[PDB]
Amino acid sequence: LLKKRAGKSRFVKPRRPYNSEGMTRILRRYEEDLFCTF
Amino acid sequence: GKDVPFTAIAGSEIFSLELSKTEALTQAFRKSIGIKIKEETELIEGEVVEIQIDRSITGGHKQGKLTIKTTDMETIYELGNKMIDGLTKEKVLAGDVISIDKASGKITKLGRSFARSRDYDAMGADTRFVQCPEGELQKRKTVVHTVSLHEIDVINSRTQGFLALFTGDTGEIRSEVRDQINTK
Amino acid sequence: GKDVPFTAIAGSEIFSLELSKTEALTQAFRKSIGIKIKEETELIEGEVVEIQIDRSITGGHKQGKLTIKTTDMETIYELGNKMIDGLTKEKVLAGDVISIDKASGKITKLGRSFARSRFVQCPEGELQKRKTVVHTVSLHEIDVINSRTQGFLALFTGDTGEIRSEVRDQINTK
Amino acid sequence: ISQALSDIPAITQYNMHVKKGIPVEDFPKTGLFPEPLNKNFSSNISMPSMDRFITESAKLRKLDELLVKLKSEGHRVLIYFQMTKMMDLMEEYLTYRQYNHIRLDGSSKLEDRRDLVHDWQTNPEIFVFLLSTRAGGLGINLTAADTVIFYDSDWNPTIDSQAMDRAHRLGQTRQVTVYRLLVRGTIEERMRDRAKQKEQVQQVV
Amino acid sequence: AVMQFRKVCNHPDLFERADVDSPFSFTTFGKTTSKFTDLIYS
Amino acid sequence: KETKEVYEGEVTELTPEDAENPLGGYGKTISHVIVGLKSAKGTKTLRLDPTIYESIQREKVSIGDVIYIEANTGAVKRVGRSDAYATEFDLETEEYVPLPKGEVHKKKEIVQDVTLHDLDVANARPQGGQDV
Amino acid sequence: KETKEVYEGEVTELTPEDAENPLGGYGKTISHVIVGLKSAKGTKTLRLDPTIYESIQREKVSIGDV
Amino acid sequence: AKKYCDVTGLKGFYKSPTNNIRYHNAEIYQLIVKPMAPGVDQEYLKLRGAN
DNA sequence: ATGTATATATCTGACACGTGCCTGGAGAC
DNA sequence: TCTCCAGGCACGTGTCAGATATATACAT
Numbered sequence: 043l044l045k046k047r048a049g050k051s052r053f054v055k056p057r058r059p060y061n062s063e064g065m066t067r068i069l070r071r072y073e074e075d076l077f078c079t080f
Numbered sequence: 081g082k083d084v085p086f087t088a089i090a091g092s093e094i095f096s097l098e099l100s101k102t103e104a105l106t107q108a109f110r111k112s113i114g115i116k117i118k119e120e121t122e123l124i125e126g127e128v129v130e131i132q133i134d135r136s137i138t139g140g141h142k143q144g145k146l147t148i149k150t151t152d153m154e155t156i157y158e159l160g161n162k163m164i165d166g167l168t169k170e171k172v173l174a175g176d177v178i179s180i181d182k183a184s185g186k187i188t189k190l191g192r193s194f195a196r197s198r199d200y201d202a203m204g205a206d207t208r209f210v211q212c213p214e215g216e217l218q219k220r221k222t223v224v225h226t227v228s229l230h231e232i233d234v235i236n237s238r239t240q241g242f243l244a245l246f247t248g249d250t251g252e253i254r255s256e257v258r259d260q261i262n263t264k
Numbered sequence: 265g266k267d268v269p270f271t272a273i274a275g276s277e278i279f280s281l282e283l284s285k286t287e288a289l290t291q292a293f294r295k296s297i298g299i300k301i302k303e304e305t306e307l308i309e310g311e312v313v314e315i316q317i318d319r320s321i322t323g324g325h326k327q328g329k330l331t332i333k334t335t336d337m338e339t340i341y342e343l344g345n346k347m348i349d350g351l352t353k354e355k356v357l358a359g360d361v362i363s364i365d366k367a368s369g370k371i372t373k374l375g376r377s378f379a380r381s382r383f384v385q386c387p388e389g390e391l392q393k394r395k396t397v398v399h400t401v402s403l404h405e406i407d408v409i410n411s412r413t414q415g416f417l418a419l420f421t422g423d424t425g426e427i428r429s430e431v432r433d434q435i436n437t438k
Numbered sequence: 439i440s441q442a443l444s445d446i447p448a449i450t451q452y453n454m455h456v457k458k459g460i461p462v463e464d465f466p467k468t469g470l471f472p473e474p475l476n477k478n479f480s481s482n483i484s485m486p487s488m489d490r491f492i493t494e495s496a497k498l499r500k501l502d503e504l505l506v507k508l509k510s511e512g513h514r515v516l517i518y519f520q521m522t523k524m525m526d527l528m529e530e531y532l533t534y535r536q537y538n539h540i541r542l543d544g545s546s547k548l549e550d551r552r553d554l555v556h557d558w559q560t561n562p563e564i565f566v567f568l569l570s571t572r573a574g575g576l577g578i579n580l581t582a583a584d585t586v587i588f589y590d591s592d593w594n595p596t597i598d599s600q601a602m603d604r605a606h607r608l609g610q611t612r613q614v615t616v617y618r619l620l621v622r623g624t625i626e627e628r629m630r631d632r633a634k635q636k637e638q639v640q641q642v643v
Numbered sequence: 644a645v646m647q648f649r650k651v652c653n654h655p656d657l658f659e660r661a662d663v664d665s666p667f668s669f670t671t672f673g674k675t676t677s678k679f680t681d682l683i684y685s
Numbered sequence: 686k687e688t689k690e691v692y693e694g695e696v697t698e699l700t701p702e703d704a705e706n707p708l709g710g711y712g713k714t715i716s717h718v719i720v721g722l723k724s725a726k727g728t729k730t731l732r733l734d735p736t737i738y739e740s741i742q743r744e745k746v747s748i749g750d751v752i753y754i755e756a757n758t759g760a761v762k763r764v765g766r767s768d769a770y771a772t773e774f775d776l777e778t779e780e781y782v783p784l785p786k787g788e789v790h791k792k793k794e795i796v797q798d799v800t801l802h803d804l805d806v807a808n809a810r811p812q813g814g815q816d817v
Numbered sequence: 818k819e820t821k822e823v824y825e826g827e828v829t830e831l832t833p834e835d836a837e838n839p840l841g842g843y844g845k846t847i848s849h850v851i852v853g854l855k856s857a858k859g860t861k862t863l864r865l866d867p868t869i870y871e872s873i874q875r876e877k878v879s880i881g882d883v
Numbered sequence: 884a885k886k887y888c889d890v891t892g893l894k895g896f897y898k899s900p901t902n903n904i905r906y907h908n909a910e911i912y913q914l915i916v917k918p919m920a921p922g923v924d925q926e927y928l929k930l931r932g933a934n
Numbered sequence: 935a936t937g938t939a940t941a942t943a944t945c946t947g948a949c950a951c952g953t954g955c956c957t958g959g960a961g962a963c
Numbered sequence: 964t965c966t967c968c969a970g971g972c973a974c975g976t977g978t979c980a981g982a983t984a985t986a987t988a989c990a991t
Binding site: 355 | 673674
């Protein structure tokens with residue numbers, strides 16, 4: 043019965059991986075800015 | 081009228097010390113034949129929100145994310161090298177409404193809409209009060225630009241031919257370049 | 265015949281824009297005298313049977329055993345790391361025939377042998393052959409080499425550019 | 439010279455700077471190679487142009503001419519083929535338009551057909567359908583599509599009528615248009631004339 | 644003979660495909676006579 | 686009728702290994718570069734010299750871009766971004782191409798039509814190697 | 818003709834201060850830069866963009882320079 | 884240590900892979916190293932202690 | 935009048951790979 | 964002889980080779 047039932051009756055793409063290691067960062071927001079250096 | 085090339089030269093300009101007479105006449109011939117090319121560009125105008133720019137220690141490698149928004153649509157992006165070099169010029173302070181042409185690579189700051197209160201008093205900024213744009217963030221547009229055959233020849237001739245547009249250092253472009261340009 | 269230079273220029277060949285007429289005539293004169301040098305070099309040419317290369321996790325040290333054969337004899341060779349680096353570069357597999365310059369590390373693949381299951385016969389005789397090559401060269405070739413303003417590419421791009429006479433007395437005396 | 443003509447990787451610059459104490463001033467000089475004009479001008483290897491692929495066949499050119507306004511209309515489109523490799527390179531055209539498409543033929547597995555018809559009848563975001571003449575043109579419920587594109591389906595008018603009846607079924611809520619693309623002055627003219635005379639023979643009797 | 648007058652109408656790439664466009668490499672390099680593979684410039 | 690050795694596929698990983706003494710005067714900054722190339726029905730790991738990596742980073746490739754390493758001259762071509770990832774979040778007027786069919790390592794036959802003057806020009810002014 | 822707004826003078830005090838919430842994985846997360854200026858009958862300290870400190874490092878600016 | 888041919892005491896260039904005896908030129912490999920009896924190898928290499 | 939030629943289109947049919955598991959071969963005394 | 968973990972055995976799913984069929988114009 044299980045074999046008969048199996049034989050008879052049986053999106054949004056991901057973004058690019060952002061990668062940044064050992065890389066200085068500049069942020070720019072509404073009220074403040076950042077400069078993360080090394 | 082406009083959009084039609086018109087090369088007006090005298091007789092004495094053919095004799096040159098860098099070019100043969102046939103090369104100068106071939107350049108004068110190819111300056112007068114125009115190619116009108118259509119292009120599909122995208123105009124992105126919106127009030128910017130967060131600008132994240134990631135540069136290396138030497139400052140050569142550059143990548144980052146751009147978060148822009150309008151009244152009805154918020155959308156973050158990804159930045160190339162020329163995009164970051166254009167953003168470093170004409171200083172954006174995270175709240176100035178900008179307009180980006182996708183195919184031309186032109187960054188135009190329309191003005192400031194946020195009207196930031198706390199500001200470091202170092203710049204002489206007197207940016208105009210423009211309004212935050214509403215509607216669709218990304219708009220498709222079809223443009224046409226006119227170039228002539230000599231320009232495409234000099235551009236395809238060598239590595240830095242765009243400088244040879246203006247310096248005139250286009251010395252005897254080979255026949256293979258000309259026939260391949262005709263075929264293309 | 266061969267081994268003797270024969271320059272064939274025309275009358276209009278010397279009216280150049282970067283070389284003077286006397287410079288072109290001097291180059292045409294010195295192109296037609298040969299220098300004959302016989303030199304001997306050891307070479308290893310044979311058919312490669314099997315290459316075994318073992319390496320660590322980081323590849324700090326590489327040990328390699330290369331068995332190689334001719335129609336007359338075969339041998340196994342232990343290779344250092346530089347020659348392993350010269351064998352994975354210019355990839356040599358089983359059944360290929362190569363010529364190895366032991367002093368300079370120049371390995372040239374002559375093709376594949378008669379094993380299909382290009383094509384060139386397996387070399388015969390001794391593996392380490394002492395070949396004496398009779399080199400001939402023109403004095404104009406040594407003039408641009410001994411002149412330091414231009415390299416050997418001026419023999420091929422034709423941009424020697426008015427070689428001075430002070431190097432010409434040096435190559436004549438040498 | 440080679441370090442002058444290119445850049446150091448960023449993680450390598452990080453490892454030399456703060457994990458080895460080397461300051462920025464004593465770094466080797468880098469990035470002196472000039473920028474090319476475009477990304478196209480950066481190398482002399484040219485890929486096969488997709489635009490040269492589509493523009494060299496005029497039937498595909500007319501199909502792409504009508505498909506822009508068909509997508510702007512917000513429609514559902516079926517396309518029927520006879521040849522399997524033309525049924526295989528149409529995905530290369532559809533990836534250029536990044537359209538949502540499915541592929542159905544008799545070489546496919548049988549149990550993919552039932553849920554393929556199911557995601558046809560429930561998911562509305564699907565746009566493009568690729569079918570064979572005798573596989574999808576027989577008795578399959580295609581009630582939410584009206585525009586059937588006959589790329590080369592003129593070989594037998596009975597199979598064309600069956601493929602018409604597979605889509606022109608009951609339950610359609612709007613008008614049905616059938617487009618038939620062909621080139622002129624070819625063997626397709628005589629083949630379509632033979633199909634038309636067979637159609638007249640079938641229609642009379 | 645039926646195989647060659649029908650799909651010339653559909654697409655010319657059904658017979659021969661468009662290959663990559665590259666300059667002729669005037670080079671004698673190390674080619675292959677066929678957990679990583681070493682790629683060294685030669 | 687010229688044969689070509691082609692290594693192409695989508696770049697998955699890009700990990701350079703540094704040198705022991707990068708400021709020793711002689712030698713290179715890095716030792717090798719690990720590149721993970723994945724195409725249709727195949728996935729290969731590539732260990733390179735510095736020299737091929739100079740041309741590879743001359744094209745400004747990254748993670749998720751499909752490349753085309755021609756092993757004849759060492760020249761590489763950035764084919765474009767892959768459409769396995771997102772599409773509508775770019776400002777760099779990019780083009781998106783699917784995964785290359787077949788395995789990563791290839792040997793294909795290209796029929797070239799050149800003249801003798803082109804050979805003389807290419808040998809007179811040499812370009813396309815990976816040297817100075 | 819052009820109008821140029823300029824600042825000039827000796828450097829009396831120069832220090833970039835960290836932000837109130839330092840970002841992890843980085844050193845010296847700067848929020849703004851305080852630079853003091855001094856000229857003839859003139860002395861003014863001022864706030865600055867944090868990216869200017871990179872050009873300050875590029876220019877070798879210390880206390881006592883103009 | 885300098886490699887030497889085990890047949891003649893000469894300068895050994897080649898070592899045979901089948902039986903690990905160094906030899907100097909081709910003909911000792913032809914009529915000595917190839918047709919040698921099994922078991923001759925062990926006191927052939929006993930001189931340099933390679934067994 | 936009939937073979938056939940060369941590509942379909944379906945369409946099965948026999949064969950090689952990606953997960954569990956347990957127990958005996960390996961390290962140590 | 965004590966321990967222990969992964970090597971080989973067992974059980975599933977996809978993927979290239981044969982078989983009938985259309986089919987229509989050409990040649991014998």
